[PDB]
Amino acid sequence: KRPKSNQDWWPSKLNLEILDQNARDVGPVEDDFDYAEEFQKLDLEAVKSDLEELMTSSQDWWPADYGHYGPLFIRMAWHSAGTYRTADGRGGAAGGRQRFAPINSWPDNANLDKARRLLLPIKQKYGQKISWADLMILAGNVAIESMGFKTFGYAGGREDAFEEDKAVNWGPEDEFETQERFDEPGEIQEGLGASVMGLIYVNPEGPDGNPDPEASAKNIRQTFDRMAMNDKETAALIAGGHTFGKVHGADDPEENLGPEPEAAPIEQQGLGWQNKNMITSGIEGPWTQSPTEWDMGYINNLLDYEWEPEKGPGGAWQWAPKSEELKNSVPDAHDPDEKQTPMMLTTDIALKRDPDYREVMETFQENPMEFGMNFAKAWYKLTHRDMGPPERFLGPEVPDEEMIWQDPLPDADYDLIGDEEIAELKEEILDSDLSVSQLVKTAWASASTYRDSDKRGGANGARLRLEPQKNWEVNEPEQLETVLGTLENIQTEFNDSRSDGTQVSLADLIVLGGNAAVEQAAANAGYDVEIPFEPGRVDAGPEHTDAPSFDALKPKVDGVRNYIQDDITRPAEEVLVDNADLLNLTASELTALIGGMRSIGANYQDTDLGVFTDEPETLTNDFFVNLLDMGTEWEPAADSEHRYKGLDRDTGEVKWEATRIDLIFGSNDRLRAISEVYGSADAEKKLVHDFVDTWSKVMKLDRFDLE
Amino acid sequence: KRPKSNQDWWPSKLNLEILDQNARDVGPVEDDFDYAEEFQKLDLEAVKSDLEELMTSSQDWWPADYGHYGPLFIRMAWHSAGTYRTADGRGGAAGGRQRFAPINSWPDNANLDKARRLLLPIKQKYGQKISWADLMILAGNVAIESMGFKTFGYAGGREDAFEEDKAVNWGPEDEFETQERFDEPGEIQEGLGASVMGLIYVNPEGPDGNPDPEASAKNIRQTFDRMAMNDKETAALIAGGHTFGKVHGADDPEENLGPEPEAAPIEQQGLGWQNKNGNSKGGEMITSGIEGPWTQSPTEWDMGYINNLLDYEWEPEKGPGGAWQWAPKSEELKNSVPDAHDPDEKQTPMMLTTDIALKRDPDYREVMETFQENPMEFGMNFAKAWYKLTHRDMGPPERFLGPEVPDEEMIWQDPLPDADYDLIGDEEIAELKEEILDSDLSVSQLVKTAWASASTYRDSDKRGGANGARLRLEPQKNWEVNEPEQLETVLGTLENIQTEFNDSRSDGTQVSLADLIVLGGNAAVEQAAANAGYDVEIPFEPGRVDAGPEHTDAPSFDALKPKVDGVRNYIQDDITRPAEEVLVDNADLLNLTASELTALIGGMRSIGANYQDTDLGVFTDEPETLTNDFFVNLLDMGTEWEPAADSEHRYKGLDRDTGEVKWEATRIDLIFGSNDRLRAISEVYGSADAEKKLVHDFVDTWSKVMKLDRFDLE
Ligand code: HEM
Ligand code: HEM
Ligand SMILES: [Cl-]
Numbered sequence A: 001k002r003p004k005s006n007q008d009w010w011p012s013k014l015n016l017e018i019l020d021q022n023a024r025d026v027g028p029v030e031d032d033f034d035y036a037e038e039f040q041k042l043d044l045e046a047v048k049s050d051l052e053e054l055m056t057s058s059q060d061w062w063p064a065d066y067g068h069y070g071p072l073f074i075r076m077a078w079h080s081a082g083t084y085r086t087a088d089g090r091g092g093a094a095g096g097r098q099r100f101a102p103i104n105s106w107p108d109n110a111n112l113d114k115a116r117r118l119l120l121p122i123k124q125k126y127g128q129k130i131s132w133a134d135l136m137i138l139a140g141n142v143a144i145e146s147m148g149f150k151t152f153g154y155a156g157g158r159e160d161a162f163e164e165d166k167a168v169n170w171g172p173e174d175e176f177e178t179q180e181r182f183d184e185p186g187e188i189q190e191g192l193g194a195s196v197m198g199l200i201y202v203n204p205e206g207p208d209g210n211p212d213p214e215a216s217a218k219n220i221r222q223t224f225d226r227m228a229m230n231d232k233e234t235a236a237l238i239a240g241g242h243t244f245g246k247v248h249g250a251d252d253p254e255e256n257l258g259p260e261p262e263a264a265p266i267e268q269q270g271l272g273w274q275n276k277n278m279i280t281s282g283i284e285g286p287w288t289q290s291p292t293e294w295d296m297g298y299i300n301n302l303l304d305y306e307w308e309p310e311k312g313p314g315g316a317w318q319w320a321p322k323s324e325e326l327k328n329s330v331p332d333a334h335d336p337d338e339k340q341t342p343m344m345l346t347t348d349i350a351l352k353r354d355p356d357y358r359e360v361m362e363t364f365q366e367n368p369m370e371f372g373m374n375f376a377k378a379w380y381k382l383t384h385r386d387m388g389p390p391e392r393f394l395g396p397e398v399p400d401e402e403m404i405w406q407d408p409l410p411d412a413d414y415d416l417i418g419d420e421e422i423a424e425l426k427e428e429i430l431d432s433d434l435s436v437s438q439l440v441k442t443a444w445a446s447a448s449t450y451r452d453s454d455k456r457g458g459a460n461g462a463r464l465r466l467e468p469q470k471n472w473e474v475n476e477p478e479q480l481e482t483v484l485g486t487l488e489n490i491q492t493e494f495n496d497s498r499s500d501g502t503q504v505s506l507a508d509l510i511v512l513g514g515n516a517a518v519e520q521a522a523a524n525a526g527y528d529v530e531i532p533f534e535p536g537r538v539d540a541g542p543e544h545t546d547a548p549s550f551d552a553l554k555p556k557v558d559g560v561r562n563y564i565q566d567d568i569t570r571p572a573e574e575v576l577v578d579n580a581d582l583l584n585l586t587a588s589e590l591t592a593l594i595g596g597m598r599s600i601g602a603n604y605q606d607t608d609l610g611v612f613t614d615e616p617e618t619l620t621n622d623f624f625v626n627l628l629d630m631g632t633e634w635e636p637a638a639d640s641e642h643r644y645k646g647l648d649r650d651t652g653e654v655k656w657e658a659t660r661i662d663l664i665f666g667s668n669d670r671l672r673a674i675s676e677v678y679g680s681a682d683a684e685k686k687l688v689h690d691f692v693d694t695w696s697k698v699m700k701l702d703r704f705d706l707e
Numbered sequence B: 001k002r003p004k005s006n007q008d009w010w011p012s013k014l015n016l017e018i019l020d021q022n023a024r025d026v027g028p029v030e031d032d033f034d035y036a037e038e039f040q041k042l043d044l045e046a047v048k049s050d051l052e053e054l055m056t057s058s059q060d061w062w063p064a065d066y067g068h069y070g071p072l073f074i075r076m077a078w079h080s081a082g083t084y085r086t087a088d089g090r091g092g093a094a095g096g097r098q099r100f101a102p103i104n105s106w107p108d109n110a111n112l113d114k115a116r117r118l119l120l121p122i123k124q125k126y127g128q129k130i131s132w133a134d135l136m137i138l139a140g141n142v143a144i145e146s147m148g149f150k151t152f153g154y155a156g157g158r159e160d161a162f163e164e165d166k167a168v169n170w171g172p173e174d175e176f177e178t179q180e181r182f183d184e185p186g187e188i189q190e191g192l193g194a195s196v197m198g199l200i201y202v203n204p205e206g207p208d209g210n211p212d213p214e215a216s217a218k219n220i221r222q223t224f225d226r227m228a229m230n231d232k233e234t235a236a237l238i239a240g241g242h243t244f245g246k247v248h249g250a251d252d253p254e255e256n257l258g259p260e261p262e263a264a265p266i267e268q269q270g271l272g273w274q275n276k277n278g279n280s281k282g283g284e285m286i287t288s289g290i291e292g293p294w295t296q297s298p299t300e301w302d303m304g305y306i307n308n309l310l311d312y313e314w315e316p317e318k319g320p321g322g323a324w325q326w327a328p329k330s331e332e333l334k335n336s337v338p339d340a341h342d343p344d345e346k347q348t349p350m351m352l353t354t355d356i357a358l359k360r361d362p363d364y365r366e367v368m369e370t371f372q373e374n375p376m377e378f379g380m381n382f383a384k385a386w387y388k389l390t391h392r393d394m395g396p397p398e399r400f401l402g403p404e405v406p407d408e409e410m411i412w413q414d415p416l417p418d419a420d421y422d423l424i425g426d427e428e429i430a431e432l433k434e435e436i437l438d439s440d441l442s443v444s445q446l447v448k449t450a451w452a453s454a455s456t457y458r459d460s461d462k463r464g465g466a467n468g469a470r471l472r473l474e475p476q477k478n479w480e481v482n483e484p485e486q487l488e489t490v491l492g493t494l495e496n497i498q499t500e501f502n503d504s505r506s507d508g509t510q511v512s513l514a515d516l517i518v519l520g521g522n523a524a525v526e527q528a529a530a531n532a533g534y535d536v537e538i539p540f541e542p543g544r545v546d547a548g549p550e551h552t553d554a555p556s557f558d559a560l561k562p563k564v565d566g567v568r569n570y571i572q573d574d575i576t577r578p579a580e581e582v583l584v585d586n587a588d589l590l591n592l593t594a595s596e597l598t599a600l601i602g603g604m605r606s607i608g609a610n611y612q613d614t615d616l617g618v619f620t621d622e623p624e625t626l627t628n629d630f631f632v633n634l635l636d637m638g639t640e641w642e643p644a645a646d647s648e649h650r651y652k653g654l655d656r657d658t659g660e661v662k663w664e665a666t667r668i669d670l671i672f673g674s675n676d677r678l679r680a681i682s683e684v685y686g687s688a689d690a691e692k693k694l695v696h697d698f699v700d701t702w703s704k705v706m707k708l709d710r711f712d713l714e
């Protein structure tokens, strides 16, 4: 049958598999392959030309509605990007993961297996020059353009994944199309981007399957907010999207559709939902009179007529006009000698019955140009929000205008410091009254916000000094101000002492200071190490920063600083591993980082938690040696939720204090094996260098400008 | 809280994670680190000295029975190697995986967490010079040696793993210490080495917990047989092992022992089974739930076990741990053993149902009788069996390192003869390939034969491979999958070439059939690539030798016979699992990643090397021409697939429009267009710019498989 996994035997076993994913890139792509360079070779217009032809090239295994695949591709592209959550930046269209389980078999992605299959020929034709990820979004753009609407822009650069992202927790439910995440609409469990397991954002029929538009609006507003969209963007996206195509529900899905892709027979070759006798959502009908043309049909139909809920031919909730003025005003999608009546979903009526969405819809209807621009910009934002800063956007269709949601960075209008200035500045920093701990902590506070999921955060920009980061509890505002003030004076003095047009950013000084401190700690232990350093980081201002959007990067747990927000729901070590994944760390790198860090001591509020050493600020393997010493016995700290005491097994002496973050490295079976290596007699030099390599890696995660 | 795995949503989803494990090595060890070289720097004698010293250096957190940890360490080493299965060669001590879940938390490994912990100081002291895997076995040897019994030998070389082997299926049970693998004793589901989930071999109390000695012997015999041991070896091992130590069951473990390691509190730091009364209490120690020593002198090698077992009558009873155990019917042995911890107390010997089984079983009894009559014979058999037990998963002699490796090579090591001649050079290699290609052998024949030779290798216990050319010997020469008659013809032609090459040499150069089989396969592949317009040169290294029947334990190779073969699209009409699942299972033994397996099969189908020369999966109108036709045609939506009528494994590729039968295939071929991840790989190779990449990736995988057993070149 199949081996039983350890997680099956022990549900609470640390989920290290998410870090293992950072230890290797599955798939056949060569390590030295550069997608950006390959995409640069692509003739984008040629791909777009082929996509446009495909729009009206119906394939017999999935006949195009109205003879135009446009709407289907738009839904496909929207769903690809629609799984994004601002909480951890996971989900999204960047890896084209809609192609892998579980996403490929989610109920909401029914028949998109066919949409993706239609693009196979074009994918094969251009090969590595265009990823599935880039292609699916481009397909959506061409669909929109071919139907009479100009897009705001397009960027390539999304590298294809070859498996699912194991780190994404899609929710607590054990069944698709069920919800155990909200009791009241608009009160969805934190950290989730949808209101139902297996859906993109919300239930099209209404919350809990009840056709209550006002209530639906509350889940619509919250889920979209959790996907970085406000009221105008949300209304424009829904109305813009539903200006095209139709919903499919000729009959009930539960009884007429075969198994989803992952559960379908091998002969179906990746396809699923085989019709036993089109049925997709189970809801049936077009929103507008001309489903393949951009116009004001959706907004006018919604606002100018009265709608009432009913059960459609698929047994699902949908709305019909009270009058018969729109009766059979739409041509059937396939039967040339037949017609249909427009329909509205509960989620569409929501935009009309919610007072705030209604104001936006009224404004859009009165001025089509405003409706258009809002949709154009929101579609661009939707499909590029997980791609990171402007440097990563590739191709001839990238707009000249950089949007605030890209977390743009100013240009460094000055010459960068050379090897001589660098060494100079490093001594100047170590010459200041700043301690090794202050420098390391500050460099970490700056770089640690980066998350590889949507490429946001990092030391470039020195946003640590701006709102909201400068005031985050974890960053110890008052302590932080002291360090930045000192580094700022060093920057000022240096920039003034220059005459050759050279300047240094505060962003670089923070990282350089961190490097200098680590090299010092290593020196204190008898090791001579040179940490790679590359200048070029710039100082972003508040004008390059959407402050509220950065709250999403605020940590509840920080291993390096041994900070644990006394409010977390999951065990601290689980959040630690979750966070480590965003920094692209393997279990070994995480171990080396935390262990090495504890010998230096850079804890929040300067606690001694996990600092198992008699010589702080001295990079050694003391953390592991003392952690593994059986002469010490550990016990939970009295009246504490995360702290432990390390007592001498014999004399009873309280030798150390620690958190679960520290102790997991001596408890988890795999982490302990790594700890034993670093805690060995002739392994300190290795630990020092592995710590240095990981430190350097994190400091450079957001350096897309150097790629 | 944690993400739900795809396996949870779809229990039947292909387990590609076992191949992903081959795509990288977790842990902090550098890729260029060579353990063999590091182990050579080790002062083995120095380590053994510290081990012997540790034996009698009792730690208070886990007091040593009778003041000697020896017996505990023997059990530890025995259990480490005891998980081995001949079926797939998985399990065993080579990776020291007893340290990782699920094995580290099996009920049968209770308190071995304490045993391994005692070795930590020594492990840290020598660092990379000695692996946990080598150390645990060495600890067992030193324990035995320190207690009056010299060992047959010892070899280092076991590289530590940093995680469990995800490919090992330990059984159907969903609960430890429960069995759903056998109705009648001795009829255990094939493929499993134990009779109960979470146990090394069998239930110490007897089958299904019933104290039935005769029934127990049936499972003991079958489980040990599946671990490569016969009657004599089995009785020698059990009798030899139980000559030392005691069983612990001061009270019921079910209510007096804390959670196993994986479920234990973080402050336990890797340990588990916390005793309610305290692990410090030697007299309250609980492990199996069974209590008492086997002999009067638990820390001394002697005939105590065999004598107590045979010379007295034993009867069933419930011990203080609430488990079945046997006591002397008389009182001649009453309080004949000193208490393991109380200086002023005595204890009475006990026997397990499994021990009594050796006396009740007619055949086991005969062996035990002979052992009792010949103490020297008992020692001889136990010494060799202990050596075999602890080294059976290390592969051929070339891999055994250290000064304690016996000069004598054992048959179970699958020994190889030395090549008494100079190996062929660049010129000869070139001449031989042309000669082979000049013969009347086709590309398909050459490729098929080279695969039949190399594909038997399995990285689990490192048995098999093309070195030795055992393909030409029993039992492989007659394996159905190898098409005996067809094979004979190819080998005859290759042997004729070997003959003319060897006879034409004026120097001391000769070539082995083993090398010619691989050389011919390489030549055929290069030829197929050339037919496609690609000039490739496959890496080749001579040196393989031709092993004889004297170097081969024929019956033992039966375990390497495949039920499925992807390269040859062979599917035995008996398999229980879907063919693609066996395919992946087998790919893992060859250390392949999902991408390598895909390139291999896809590329292979353009060559066409199928069993019985069928056209299954051969999606190309130009066989023996290495291209990406397989992927291009498999992915073409113009083709629709369906199960073949009245067929157990065949499927038909029909023209969606005309209905014409374009191709025929098996699940081995179609899984690459069905599974979400494999399909992503197929799409890459099936693209207009990837044929060259496919060719080179195919070549790299072919070359990799051909060289898997070349330990002689390491
Ligand atoms: C409150 C959020 C929304 C809900 C609940 C929702 C839901 C639905 C449902 C149930 C269907 C029909 C699937 C089927 O039976 O074929 C559909 C289709 C469609 N959606 Fe939406 N949607 C939302 C937002 C969006 C957005 C943001 C866009 C893109 C800018 C878009 C685009 C489309 C298009 C073009 C179709 C037509 C597909 C076709 O003709 O095959 N939708 N939607
Ligand atoms: C049919 C197979 C066997 C069964 C069912 C079995 C069973 C058991 C049980 C239940 C225990 C006690 C665990 C405990 O409470 O502490 C134990 C221990 C022991 N076993 Fe066996 N065993 C088998 C074979 C073997 C072999 C093959 C060896 C090694 C050559 C070995 C050697 C030992 C030693 C040295 C001890 C004593 C550990 C100590 O003092 O702490 N056993 N066994
Ligand atoms: Cl299992």
Ligand SMILES: [Cl-]
Pocket: A026, A027, A028, B023, B593, B594, B595, B596
């Ligand atoms: Cl792979």
Ligand SMILES: [Cl-]
Pocket: A028, A029, A030, A033
């Ligand atoms: Cl590549």
Ligand SMILES: [Cl-]
Pocket: A083, A090, A091, A092, A097, A165, A168
């Ligand atoms: Cl994802």
Ligand SMILES: [Cl-]
Pocket: A195, A196, A202, A203, A206, A207, A208, A216, A219
């Ligand atoms: Cl909802």
Ligand SMILES: [Cl-]
Pocket: A177, A178, A179, A196, A203, A207, A208, A209
């Ligand atoms: Cl619901």
Ligand SMILES: [Cl-]
Pocket: A305, A306, A307, A308, A352
């Ligand atoms: Cl209305």
Ligand SMILES: [Cl-]
Pocket: A407, A456, A457, A458, A460, A461, A463
């Ligand atoms: Cl940032």
Ligand SMILES: [Cl-]
Pocket: A466, A467, A542
């Ligand atoms: Cl600010």
Ligand SMILES: [Cl-]
Pocket: A545, A546, A547, A548
């Ligand atoms: Cl702001």
Ligand SMILES: [Cl-]
Pocket: A557, A558, A559, A560, A575, A576, A579, A580
């Ligand atoms: Cl963290």
Ligand SMILES: [Cl-]
Pocket: A023, A586, A587, A588, A589, B026, B027, B028
């Ligand atoms: Cl790792």
Ligand SMILES: [Cl-]
Pocket: A168, A169, A170, A171, B002, B003, B004, B005
């Ligand atoms: Cl999940």
Ligand SMILES: [Cl-]
Pocket: B028, B029, B030, B033
């Ligand atoms: Cl190393």
Ligand SMILES: [Cl-]
Pocket: B083, B090, B091, B092, B097, B165, B168
């Ligand atoms: Cl294993």
Ligand SMILES: [Cl-]
Pocket: B564, B565, B566, B567, B582, B583, B586, B587
């Ligand atoms: Cl196979």
